[PDB]
Amino acid sequence: IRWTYARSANIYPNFRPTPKTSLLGALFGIGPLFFWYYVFKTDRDKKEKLIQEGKLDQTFNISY
């Protein structure tokens, strides 16, 4: 019971927003989000550019 309580219900009351905790939370929460946003945005921009200039082949792309 104590193990279950400490894992779930006792986390926040014993949490203190120290600089370590804040920086770890930021780098683990918004870090990967921005990384994936950058990757996907660059990929989509490349695809759109290739479509715009007509240098991308889509011969049988009739399902999307």
Partner: peptide, 29 residues
């Protein structure tokens, strides 16, 4: 209510009470 996990122990009295709560020894806790 006193047999649930609590805040970080600060006084040696709290460290002994927590050790008793978790069925440990004060030195080992």
């Amino acid at each position: 209510k006193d047999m649930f996990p609590g805040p970080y122990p600060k006084t040696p009295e709290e460290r002994a009470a927590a050790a008793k709560k978790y069925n440990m020894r004060v030195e080992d806790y």
